[PDB]
Amino acid sequence: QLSPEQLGMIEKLVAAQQLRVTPWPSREARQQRFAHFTELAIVSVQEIVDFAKQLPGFLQLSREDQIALLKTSAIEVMLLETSRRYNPGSESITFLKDFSYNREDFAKAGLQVEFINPIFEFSRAMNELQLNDAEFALLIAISIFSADRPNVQDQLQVERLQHTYVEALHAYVSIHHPHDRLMFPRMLMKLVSLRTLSSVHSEQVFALRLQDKKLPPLLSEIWDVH
Amino acid sequence: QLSPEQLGMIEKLVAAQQLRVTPWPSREARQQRFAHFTELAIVSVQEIVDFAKQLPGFLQLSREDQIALLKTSAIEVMLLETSRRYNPGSESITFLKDFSYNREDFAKAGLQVEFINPIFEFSRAMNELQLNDAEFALLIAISIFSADRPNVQDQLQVERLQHTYVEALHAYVSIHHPHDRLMFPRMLMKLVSLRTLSSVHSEQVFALRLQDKKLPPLLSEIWDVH
């Protein structure tokens, strides 16, 4: 049963989740579309950092572990935020309540089809689950607290924190879907798919290196190989 | 609660899971150590194919979907079998009830440390969970039945089958661990780590191409980029 402490923790995460971006438009148009997408990605990272700081236990971890966790979970959290903004009718994603983009628009922004198709296929799959704010906040917290990320020191604490979020999601889901015991493992199983997408993303970052398309400083910091 | 149908299914899976190998020994010794490991991998692929054929619902999928599922789950299932054979004391893996190998033996067999370390790290984490025959057989079935694998046509049926194993695991774990509700999601979360291991193995396969080290026909078929 959902305890008062889990209830309060989830609600605070939901509340915690509740600007000159280069506008969407030749080498000039190509550069502008890419800059639009990298700038939306920069806004997304900033929001993830702000939300991560509000997660019980996150700021108690060493700053080094905070960086290890955010560095590798950023793309998974960005893809979950993308899947939340999916429109099944138009097969588009709406960023910042106004910027709506489909698969062709992603290609015009410089993304390769090997990355676009899995983003849209994951988004379609996520939408079928129909997760609410609470479930998205909890899956994001579980994704951030993964003890198996590279360079994590306090693996035991990160796993202990993850389990608190998993338990709260289980209890929360038992109220939201009281007659469907498969809804809880189905949401966790989406974290498996996210790891594959993170790998497809690393291939996309590599492809940008070859075509000399440079990522802006923050994105190059968390994603490029130095 | 475990139903008679789930009980019978789990028992059949456990029963289904119940040799001319190049001996383990210069350029020739390295070539024979590499050959020894490729031959153990072949024996493993053959056992995975035999087991998958005994999984309820697997042979009703098209042969094309059967191949799509096996091609990309083979490495994950092999690494689960590897984790099941881990010796925490000597920090080694025992293959075919005799051949015990450590991190240095894997390096001698042509494996890069970037892959050896995650295999042993995963095996150590898995060993802490202390899974029995039924839980390994169900996690293997869950790994095989992933609708998100590349080139799966009947994603809906593959997903419906995965949910029957997930439900059976949940009901089983509730009897095996009646006082620890976290054991079931902890087992499921190991599938998240297997996706990364699979991504790291792909990098290892690409490295072998670069060092012109050829894989035998069956491994080249399922793993090489053609």
Place this chain on the structure above:
Amino acid sequence: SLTERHKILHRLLQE
């Protein structure tokens, strides 16, 4: 097809 590109795996499944 994947089938024509995976002859050994195909044969292991058929047996």
Place this chain on the structure above:
Amino acid sequence: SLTERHKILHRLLQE
């Protein structure tokens, strides 16, 4: 450390 190689992310966390 990762900290010395992640100056922007480090500043976002500090603020």
